[PDB]
Design a protein around this ligand. Structure first.
Ligand SMILES: Cc1cc2nc3c(=O)[nH]c(=O)nc-3n(C[C@H](O)[C@H](O)[C@H](O)COP(=O)(O)O)c2cc1C
Ligand code: FES
Length: 326
């Protein structure tokens, strides 16, 4: 049940700007690490402010355009945005980790892969959400495949990897900075510009991913045309408690405000199906017999959400005070 881990050394730390720190991680003896495909992340072990150990996802970064670029890597590269008001994990990555330190990680996992079907690729990055999309861009360039990146942030001063991405993509990089535009990214115009059949890869904050989801579902885009990678944690936000009644056996649990339905069930004892835990994979779907749902996933169709008979319990909640689940 414990997940396999690697003990890596911090081979380089680089302050890209005041908020974002690049870390290069190597095996102790420089041997090859598990390979990965564009979109993969690693989970890294952090110490929280009270000394509790926990795990944090960070996407793997590569700009090299050799076709073998990430098949047998000898390093993993990540970039961490410091959240001074977060839970302490990103703070640890900035303040409690030094060059030469060792760090336990879990082997790469990929919930956000590039699609090999027909069509080019349009990448939509919000802030530090650029990290797996940079690797995606590098891979499409390695393939000679059409790719465009929309990279949006509040200020250019705080957006990482602009010189690397400009060199990699040239005119196929479109940078949006709120501080220059005076307005947020125009997602409607972005979607209008996507070439017919091209697939969309959206990574970053919940508010951006939600705006893309609403519009691509309104447009009736095919379900495998749009791909989502949600960085925002915790997914259990402002949220309220609610009752869950398990219809098979009458048990009524109270889901607290800071806990997902899935985590509440996993805790109390059941064996739910799950994987990504952030609304992307679809695996945790449960039928809903009664109660209005506040849907927060990126996998159910507009029709499925409207019918009200299924939800992703890793991320979605009750609209009211009670849900009856099968
Ligand atoms: C799949 C996945 C990939 C992520 N990749 C990054 C990343 O590359 N850089 C980053 O700053 N945060 C990334 N995040 C968000 C972090 O895991 C984490 O939530 C963030 O650093 C805040 O944690 P904290 O509140 O403990 O500081 C990712 C989250 C997920 C689920
Ligand atoms: S576990 Fe992936 S959608 Fe819930």
């Amino acid at each position: 049940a414990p997940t396999a881990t690697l003990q890596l050394r911090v081979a380089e730390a680089r302050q890209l700007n005041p908020l974002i720190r690049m870390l290069r991680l190597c095996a102790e003896d420089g041997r090859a690490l598990p390979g990965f495909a564009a979109g993969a992340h690693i989970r890294v072990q952090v110490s929280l402010p009270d000394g509790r150990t926990d795990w944090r996802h960070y996407s793997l970064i590569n700009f090299a355009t050799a076709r073998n670029a990430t098949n047998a890597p000898t390093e993993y590269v990540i970039a961490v945005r410091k959240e001074a008001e977060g839970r302490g994990g990103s703070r640890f990555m900035h303040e409690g980790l030094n060059e030469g330190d060792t760090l336990a990680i879990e082997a790469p996992k990929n919930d956000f892969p590039l699609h090999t079907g027909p069509g080019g690729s349009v990448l939509v990055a919000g802030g530090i959400g650029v990290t797996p999309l940079a690797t995606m861009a590098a891979r499409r360039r390695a393939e000679g495949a059409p790719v465009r990146m929309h990279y949006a942030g509040r200020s250019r001063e705080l957006m990482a990897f602009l010189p690397e991405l400009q060199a990699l993509l040239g005119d196929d990089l479109r940078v949006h900075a709120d501080a220059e535009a005076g307005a947020p990214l125009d997602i409607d115009a972005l979607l209008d510009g996507v070439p017919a059949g091209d697939r969309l890869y959206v990574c970053g904050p919940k508010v951006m991913l939600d705006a893309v989801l609403a519009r691509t579902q309104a447009r009736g885009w095919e379900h495998d045309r749009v791909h989502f990678e949600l960085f925002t944690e915790p997914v259990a936000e402002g949220d309220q408690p609610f009752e869950v009644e398990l219809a098979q056996s009458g048990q009524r649990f109270t889901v607290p405000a800071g806990q997902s339905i899935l985590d509440c069930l996993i805790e109390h004892g059941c064996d739910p199906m799950f994987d990504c835990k952030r609304g992307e994979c679809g695996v945790c779907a449960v039928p809903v017999l009664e109660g209005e749902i506040d849907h927060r996933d990126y996998v159910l169709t507009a029709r499925e959400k409207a019918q009200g008979n299924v939800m992703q319990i890793c991320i979605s909640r009750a609209k009211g005070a009670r849900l009856v689940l099968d």
